[PDB]
Design a protein around this nucleic acid. Sequence first.
RNA 1: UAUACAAUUAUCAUAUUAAAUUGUUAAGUGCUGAUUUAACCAAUAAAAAUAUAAAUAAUUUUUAUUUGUUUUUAAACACCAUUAGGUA
RNA 2: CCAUGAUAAGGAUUAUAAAUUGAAAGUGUUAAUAUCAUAAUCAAAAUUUAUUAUUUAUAUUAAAUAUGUAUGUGUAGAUAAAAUAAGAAAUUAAAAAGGUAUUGUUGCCCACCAAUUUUUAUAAUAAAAAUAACGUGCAGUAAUUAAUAUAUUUAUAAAAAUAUAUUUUUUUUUUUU
Lengths: 155, 54, 48, 51, 41, 213, 298, 181, 203, 145, 184
Amino acid sequence: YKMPKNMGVAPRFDTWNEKYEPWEHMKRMGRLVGTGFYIPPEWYNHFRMFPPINHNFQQEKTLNPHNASEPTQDDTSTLSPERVALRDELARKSRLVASEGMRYYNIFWVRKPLDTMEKEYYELKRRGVDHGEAIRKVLQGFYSGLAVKKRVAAI
Amino acid sequence: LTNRWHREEAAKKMLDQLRRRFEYQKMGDVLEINNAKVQPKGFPTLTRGIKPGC
Amino acid sequence: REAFSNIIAVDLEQEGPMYPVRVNADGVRVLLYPARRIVANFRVADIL
Amino acid sequence: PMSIRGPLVRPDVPEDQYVDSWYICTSMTHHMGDYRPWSASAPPNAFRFRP
Amino acid sequence: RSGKARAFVFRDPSLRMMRAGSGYQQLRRMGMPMQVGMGWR
Amino acid sequence: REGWLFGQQVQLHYHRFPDEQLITNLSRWRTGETVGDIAMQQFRNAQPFDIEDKDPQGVQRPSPEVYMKLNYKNPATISRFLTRTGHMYPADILPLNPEAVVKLRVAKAQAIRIGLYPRFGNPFWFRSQKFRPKAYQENYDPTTYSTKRTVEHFAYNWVQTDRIRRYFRELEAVHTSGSASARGSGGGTTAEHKQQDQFYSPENQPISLHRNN
Amino acid sequence: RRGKPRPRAGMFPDKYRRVPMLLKPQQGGQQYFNHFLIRSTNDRLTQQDVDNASGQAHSFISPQLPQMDWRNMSARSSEESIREEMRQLAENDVMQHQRVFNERMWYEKEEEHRMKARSPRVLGGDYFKTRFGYSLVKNSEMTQGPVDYSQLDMWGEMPRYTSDMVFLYLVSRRRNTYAVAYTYEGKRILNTYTAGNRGLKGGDRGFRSEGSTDNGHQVTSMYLNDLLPKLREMRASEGRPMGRGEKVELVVRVMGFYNGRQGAVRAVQDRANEFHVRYFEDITPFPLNGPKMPRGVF
Amino acid sequence: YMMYHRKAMGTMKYSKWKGAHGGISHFYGRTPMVEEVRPNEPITLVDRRIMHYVHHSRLRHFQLFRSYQEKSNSTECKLREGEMLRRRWHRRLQKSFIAFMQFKTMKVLEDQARLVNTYGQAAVNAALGDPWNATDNVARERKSAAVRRQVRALPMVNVVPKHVATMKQIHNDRFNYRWRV
Amino acid sequence: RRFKKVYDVLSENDDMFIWLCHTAMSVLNPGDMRSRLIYNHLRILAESVASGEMTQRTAFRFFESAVRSPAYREIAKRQLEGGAATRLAGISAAADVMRRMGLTRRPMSSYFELYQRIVERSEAMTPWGFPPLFQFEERLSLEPRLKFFSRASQQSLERRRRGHVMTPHTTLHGRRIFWIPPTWNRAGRFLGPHVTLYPGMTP
Amino acid sequence: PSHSGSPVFTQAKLIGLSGEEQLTMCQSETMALRLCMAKAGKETCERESRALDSCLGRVGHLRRAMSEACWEFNDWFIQNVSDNHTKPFQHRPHDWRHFYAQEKLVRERQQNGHAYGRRPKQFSFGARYVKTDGYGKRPRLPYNK
Amino acid sequence: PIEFRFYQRYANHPNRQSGIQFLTHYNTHQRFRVNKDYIDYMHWGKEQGQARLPHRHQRVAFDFNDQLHPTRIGYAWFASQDPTFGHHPDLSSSFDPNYRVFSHPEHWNKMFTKRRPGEGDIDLSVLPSRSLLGPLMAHSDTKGIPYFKVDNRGHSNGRVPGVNAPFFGEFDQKMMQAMSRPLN
RNA sequence: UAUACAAUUAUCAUAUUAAAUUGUUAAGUGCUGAUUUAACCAAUAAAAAUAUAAAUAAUUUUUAUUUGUUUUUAAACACCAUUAGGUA
RNA sequence: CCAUGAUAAGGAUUAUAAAUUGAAAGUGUUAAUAUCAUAAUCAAAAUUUAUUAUUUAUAUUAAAUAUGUAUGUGUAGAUAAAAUAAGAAAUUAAAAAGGUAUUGUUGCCCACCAAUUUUUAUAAUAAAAAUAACGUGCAGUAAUUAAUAUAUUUAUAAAAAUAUAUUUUUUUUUUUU
Ligand SMILES: [Mg+2]
């Protein structure tokens, strides 16, 4: 017969996290301190005031891949597919609008030209201009602004 | 076409010619079981049917 | 050292369980129940 | 690595201080642990430790 | 296969005692079994 | 816990944060070396190619018109999804729709029985090549089944980079030699070079260091 | 050694491990280095003099001033110049997939350029909706308009036969290979030449090279060289005699996936001095499900 | 005997080959591959490409395996399922290698971008071979000729593995000396 | 042995650096590290890891599951589009905690390790993706050279050496440094490690 | 490295080094050299040799780069692609017993839930054409008999 | 092995890998014994983890951070709400609860034959036909069912504020008002 | 000698709601003869290819009955013979 | 005779570098078992025994006495040595893969043969069970043409061969050429 070499030392894939779960440590340390003959550690003394979140069940017990257990590790983009397509089309038509906001690193405290372009596109859409014409008009407005800037630079 | 026992003997002899104990010692080797040098002895008293020596 | 690493403790305000708890560590079925006195085998009673 | 530890099996001391031992496949020192440097044998400020 | 079945854990003693609400001793105490013999002296 | 693609333990990614490039090149950012750099500017948010089969089961092909035309009367379309010897491709190689495979097998049986199709081989294998997709070597496909078609492009790019480096290093050597010659042998070479380095050596015009010449 | 094979020279340490690297090889001739360097300098100076006579070894600097280009600055400050610069900027701002200069891209664009050198009311959405067929035409991916009959005839790829070609069957087996030649009517021109027929079967290299390319090549070459006069005399007797050094039209038909195939085709190509091969076909009875074969050992 | 049987097409005094040959023959409807050999394309290379196709398609393997010996349906199903599972596992293994090679290609492209940044775009184009010295059309025509000749794609078929005739032929599709179950 | 001792003394504190790098990078959205609540959480967990009172896996779980703000995902929908926050604040906090706590005698060593173990890892495939089993201490682990944020991750040490036919007999005939010197009882014919049977000439 | 609990026997085949699936490079110059050396000519084609060597000089550096890339790939694979002989194999039919059990369950449910893992009886090569009237020609299900 | 010791919680017997999952909607709690849907272990589990687990459109157990089953509508009714609010993510136009998925063991069965690439018992009822024959034969000059108005039931429920009627009030994503107990 | 299985998953005979069954095709020299096999070998030797849509889940299977020996052209082919053939 | 132990010979992968090309796995003599034992060179001596490089055709026996044999085309089979102060140069090491044995293949184990005996039975019955040494074998134990299940068949015995169905058989890459 054939067996993997490390099959004997293979960790249990269903109960290897319950040992390291924070709540187990919290409860055990609470009981140990409440016995009255154990000096509480600093981590217990701090986390008794701020206990961890309750709803962070691991995927091992959840057995549901589409469950976002960890809010910190959650990765779900807020952009709808329509918004993604719109901004991708705008960036593909003009690389200036896409790169102008970001450049080497995302400056999160300044206005984004792509955001302004999307806002103007939405305004044109609700005014009555359809997709292609609205995109062309907003791009031409951005180019007019850039032309003003370049004219000032030349002067 | 050769028989199995002759093939085995020939292969063993050829491997011996072409080509451990201290690393691994089993209970038989330790207690002198497999060793053909060690042989039990008999009782010194002489029998009656055995042909006299010389 | 392993025992001190895996040491545990319980809440003694009750001095005994208030509900039957049934588990099994390595197939050995263990039942702990409330009782008037400490009634169990000598070794487990000494552990309790 | 030899590129760090150097191709030395003994402290770099003149062979006059080292004696080939008996029954042991190593060299020993008659003045145990008391290693005189090279300049001890040579005259003070000697070119290439020459006499 | 030749071995019998074994429970994963114990059966709750409270449930085991509660399921005995209609045992033969309880029936005798309620008086359901009609008497036709002499019984005890 | 494994990924469905190739049993990975982690999520495939190149850059997860919008500022890791700045963190890595903070010293260069402060010195101003990255005023007009390109590698950080374009590859900051680069992510791995989506290498997966969007239709692994096989219900994408053929086209609906090919479904309509996949009849016994036309062997041209039958030969499109049939091997050179006349056998059907395994689902591992060419995953046709179940409707496609049942239609193909029944049409092939009918055509063989009537006499419109040969029992072995296809008389339209050469003419069906245009309909058959072509994996051009010049144009790379991210989702190629084979790894050689990717390693060849990797080698091509590495050879281009090596060509850039070799060209610039040889240009530097040529310019340095020209400047030394223009300044003069005596004027250009330093005293140490003229005294010690000015001899034949394994680095300076050696004889053949190899036997069997 | 002790009844053992002698190890290869690689296992032995270096034969010249006890000599300095400068000895192997010696770099003698140091006295010539200065002489050759001075000779090189002298001849380089002479070549430089020749080049200077050919042209001019002069360089100069032009002291440009910034105030002079105010005319260019005023021209660029104009609205029209800014407009055309912004037009170029918008044209090049589109998505560009060209990272650096590519020889493939340059060759393709130049090839297309040289190939070029060698060579009312718009329909509405409602009209498109009411035209259901045009939607299918959009994604038809099928030939439209005139279509060549070469993609419709089912005998275009099939071979064209003539009454004169001789069909040469090359059968390759696990331990045998043989070639036979038939005419169009099916008459067997010459007797079959198998490995056993020619003696290659059952000799040296037994059970291994019986089906090899070597034996197949030998038997096929011998069969062709014996068949050629037989074919000539058969045609002469039939009354259609061979021409003056005519090429005999040969249709190769090969069967078997063993090793006795490459040798056969190589022999045919080596004898192609007279056997002009016109068509090549391979035949193989692919088993679907038939009678039980003899049982294997497994 | 089937046409693929071991004792098929045997040459003997009493054995007469079945079927008509020549022109419209027994194989006339059963020929799997027909190629019109043309000048400048050797028949040896034609046969080489055909054999490479039928070997890389794992078709001669099945033909020999089913033809030479009789194998039970259970054995054939076992072998085919094992082959499919091994192929799927190998595809899964190779997907990781493809992904890592794409990552290495990204690293190479980043190094190329670093070279572009440190040398200049025009300098990098010139090093890549931009026709910036093509004063006349002939200078660029020479490189066009070079790349035109390089584009010519010769057949990429390779030599097929030989067939090994082991004793008693435990496996008939065996092409390598490595032992198999 | 002296270099081994020096290496051990230098790398005795590498575990806290590994944990701090993992907390800085692996956590996709730790929030605002400048906030005193998150700063106190990180400081307490780092102190516990340094003291050894809590293992790294559980400390990381505590950090990633600690209470930060109600409707955390909804609030993050306003700021982060993809859920990935800037690492500058995280690195600054991870340096500040080690600066305040007297972890090492040299204050700059903590910052240098934190920066270097990140910049060296940034050029690897899946730089911030770690398998759960091998990310921290476990029954089955990786080689020290193949660890994620290890100080010896990148090396090209010599691993192939040519061997001659007499190597198994002359294993101890070179310039070997003997832990136990050969004696005549064991080795019948061996002069020693200091002798040279083919000496040269020196001035 | 052991993907899915099975060690990789060879990683050189993936690269293609020293294997059949190599990479074609400078094929034009290789063809020119082969033709020149095949033709009788007048002298050995040292010029073609120089051309081929100049073309393939960087092949050694390319091979070194691919070898170090393969080593880095092996390191990453050990890092996180595999399990180091932990998970059961998935490359043999008897490791997928559940799928074939499902197939047998489907067939059994189809055949009135009577025959499990049973196949129809073998029939002669020309059974549907040589058998006389009154004998079943087309094989039936193992339950139908 | 753990299976040899503990058999009440683990079954190593082949054909019983399905488990004892009670969280299915089938007539029995023994998934390996049920005969409605058969698990295709080789290809299933793409988005639902294991192969034995119920599909995303056939689940009766919901996590805290997982979306519930979308309502099938078959925005117009969100005028009173935020004008920029797009389509509600919990409203789908095409959502079938009992949507059969293609499974090789049940649909494409090849165990009777030699498992060759060319044969295998296949049923076409599982997946809608992609052939162009469909629309061409089912092409009519008259308009379709929505125009002809042959349906009198409409929505199964009488009046849905989200679908049938205009929607007022405020949205409630998490089930808070829908999962509550009256104190009056 | 009397004195507490399981019921959340147990591999040797406890099958019971399931769509089956039937298609009429293929292959036909004799010629100067070494095929197969580790080896021996026997006698015209080539051959049989068509599917899906459609049959309710139930309250009396308590109920018919059913699980690779199934009889003829070839190819396969177990007792026995030994110069070497018979036999599903 | 036997009368405990202990050194040898036997090159196959840690390499150039300021360096050695000889191993621990054991070779007659050596330190506990006894119970007729005088076996020992000091000369001039007796091949039948595996483990040893001898001088080849101009000049040939003087000091301890020192080799009379075999000329036969550098000649069958078989076989020995060297890559170190000598001169020799492109195809090579570098995968997987097993105990039913624990006395661990010199192993478990198998029937038959042989020997004792018990139980059901009284019918010239049949069946089953225990047992350290025999005889025939080598069937099984990755185990020498794989093993498992059912049916047939043969018979000194394990079993073997077939028909059909399985792998508690150790495994080798083809996503429309
Ligand atoms: Mg045996």
